[PDB]
Amino acid sequence: GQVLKARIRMDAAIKRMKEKDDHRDFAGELEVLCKLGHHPNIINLLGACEHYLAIEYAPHGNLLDFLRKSRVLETDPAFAIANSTASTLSSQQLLHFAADVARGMDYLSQKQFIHRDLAARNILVGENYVAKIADFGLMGRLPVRWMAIESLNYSVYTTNSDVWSYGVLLWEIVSLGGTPYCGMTCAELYEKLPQGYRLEKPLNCDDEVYDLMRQCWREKPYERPSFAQILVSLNRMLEERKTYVNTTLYEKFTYAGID
Ligand SMILES: Cc1ccc(C(=O)Nc2cc(CCCN(C)C)cc(C(F)(F)F)c2)cc1Nc1ncccc1-c1ccncn1
């Protein structure tokens, strides 16, 4: 369809769709969204009508673009250098986005909802900088870099594979919107992943946050943490004085690559 900002919350994004695939997908989507209920960390279905599917507007856009715009050394070096900072986002704000998504996915997974496409591109930064789970859709190419091995090999999609993808999302957050496995092809992933290859620890990252990521990517789906377990660990970290994601500038500072 076609998405435009509107007012009817009052501010809305509305999907405009003429009344065979699209008709099934629009009906299907509406069906899903009605069953989701309401929570601060999921998108807010305002309503649908026929003369159109509307959700509450998120003024800060999707999380991937938001993370990337925070890369202030690239965006505004004079501000960044003067302030010895690589990001307008603190470690606290970054882990809070991550906790929001964990909180939202715990809510959804307790209803046996399986997302299937968790990635920072599908998270909205909403009112008050509250992260909101969404799904904007997928040539319909498979999101290989976010997918659990069992999804790549057998099309097995569970809460456990959602946790895998969440771990990659966590990696995106910490790396400020870096491309996972940059400089590696998707075909190299089909090969290397079953060999036990995983994303490396970002330089700016505490071992403890890397360890949470690693738990999400266990080969055995059944050994991965639940979203509630992830949430509690993130909550623990956020309560501490300790800074977990280093955003300060140093002489050899480089960002995780994108393009
Ligand atoms: C208008 C609209 C309608 C529906 C959705 C949406 O997220 N739909 C959706 C649809 C599904 C099920 C569909 C899954 N597959 C695509 C089949 C699940 C979710 C869940 F649970 F993850 F949240 C969400 C987003 C949007 N929003 C939107 N879409 C495209 C561009 C921009 C926006 C937008 C911008 C700013 N603020 C809000 N929305």
Walk me through the structure.
With 259 residues, this protein is an alpha+beta fold. The protein has two domains: 1-60, Phosphorylase Kinase, domain 1 (2-Layer Sandwich), CATH 3.30.200; 61-259, Transferase(Phosphotransferase), domain 1. It is built from ten helices and six strands. The protein has helices at residues 21-35, 63-69, 72-75, 77-82, 91-109, 149-154, 159-174, 186-192, 207-216, 227-239; strands spanning 2-7, 11-16, 45-48, 53-56, 123-125, 131-133. Helix 5 runs antiparallel to helix 7. The protein is globular. The chain starts with a strand and ends in a 20-residue tail after the last helix. Bound molecules: ligand RAJ. It is classed as transferase. Keywords: Kinase, transferase.
Q: Could you list some keywords that capture this structure?
A:
monomer, Phosphorylase Kinase, domain 1, Transferase(Phosphotransferase), domain 1, 4-stranded antiparallel β-sheet, 40% helix, globular, binds the ligand Cc1ccc(C(=O)Nc2cc(CCCN(C)C)cc(C(F)(F)F)c2)cc1Nc1ncccc1-c1ccncn1, Angiopoietin-1 receptor
Task: Kindly state the number of beta strands.
Answer: 6
CATH superfamily placement of the largest domain: Transferase(Phosphotransferase) domain 1
Overall structural domain count: 2
Determine the fraction of residues in helical runs and give it as a percent range. 25-40%
Strand content: 5-15%
Distance between the termini: 28 Å
CATH architecture of the largest domain: Orthogonal Bundle
**Broad shape:** globular
Number of helices, counting only DSSP H or I runs of 4 residues or more? 10
Reading the helices and strands in chain order gives: EEHEEHHHHEEHHHHH
Helix/strand/pairing class, anyone?
alpha+beta
Which molecules are bound besides the chains? the ligand Cc1ccc(C(=O)Nc2cc(CCCN(C)C)cc(C(F)(F)F)c2)cc1Nc1ncccc1-c1ccncn1
Lateral arrangement of strands in the main beta sheet: 1-2-4-3
Report on the biggest sheet. 4 strands, antiparallel
Question: Could you please say which CATH topology of the largest domain applies here?
Answer: Transferase(Phosphotransferase), domain 1
* CATH class annotation of the largest domain: Mainly Alpha
Organism: Homo sapiens
Protein name: Angiopoietin-1 receptor
Cytoplasmic side: 1-259
Domain Protein kinase: 1-238
